[PDB]
Amino acid sequence: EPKVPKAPRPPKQPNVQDFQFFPPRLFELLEKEILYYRKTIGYKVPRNPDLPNSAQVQKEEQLKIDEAEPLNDEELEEKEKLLTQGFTNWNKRDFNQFIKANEKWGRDDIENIAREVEGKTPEEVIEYSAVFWERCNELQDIEKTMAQIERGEARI
């Protein structure tokens, strides 16, 4: 069991993914919603043993919940648009197939990559690839994913 359980999130919040490359502003808005949700259910931040200024960390995090407020019409307007500015049509399977195809054919072989990504057209793949190679650093576990593809691309 976690020394500190993961803090709760709004049950009906959108399941946006890192590989969909939405803009960072979207997550700032999502974090506002998460903090407000925590305020509404009376969530209290547990103090963390290690960290020295634990009392300071805990207080900092609680204050963020304490001062949380709903998203106003402006912000709500902004979020709606932001949710269209990502690769909403790319799911986990598309991503995994994209990664395996790159390892197999090399990031250059767009024709073969698209052929192996079942839910996507060459057009969709060229567009996604351009963004992927531009901000894949934002992803998590990429250092391992980049070496994995580099091993296969170089192994060819």
Binding-site annotation: residue ranges for Mg(2+): 114, 117, 120
Q: Which does 41 bind (CB under 5 to 8 A by kind): Mg ion, its own copies, none?
A: its own copies
CA distance 113 to 100: 9
CA distance 136 to 142: 7
Q: How far is the CB of 115 from Mg ion (least distance, A)?
A: 6
88 DSSP assignment = T
CA distance 128 to 84: 14
**24-43 footprint of its own copies as x/- string (CB under 8 A):** -------------x--xxxx
Query: Could you tell me the two tokens for 3?
Result: 């020394």
Ramachandran angles phi, psi of 82, nearest 5°: -55, -30
| Comparison of 2 and 52: residue with beta carbon closer to its own copies | 2
Binding residue for Mg ion, selected from 65, 113, 114, 149, defined by CB under 5 A = 114
| 122 touches its own copies (CB under 8 A) | no
Residue keyed to tokens 């547990």: 46
User: Do residues 69 and 37 lie in contact, with contact meaning Cβ atoms separated by under 8 Å?
Assistant: no
Query: For residue 123, how many C-alpha atoms fall within 13 Å in the half-sphere facing its CB?
Result: 0
| Comparison of 71 and 146: residue with beta carbon closer to its own copies | 71
**47-86 footprint of its own copies as x/- string (CB under 8 A):** -----------------------x----------------
Q: How far is the CB of 155 from its own copies (least distance, A)?
A: 27
**Cα 92–37–48 angle (5° rounding)?**
85
Q: Which residues bind Mg ion (CB under 5 A)?
A: 114, 117, 120
Q: Which residues bind its own copies (CB under 8 A)?
A: 1, 5-12, 15, 37, 40-44, 70, 91-93, 118-119
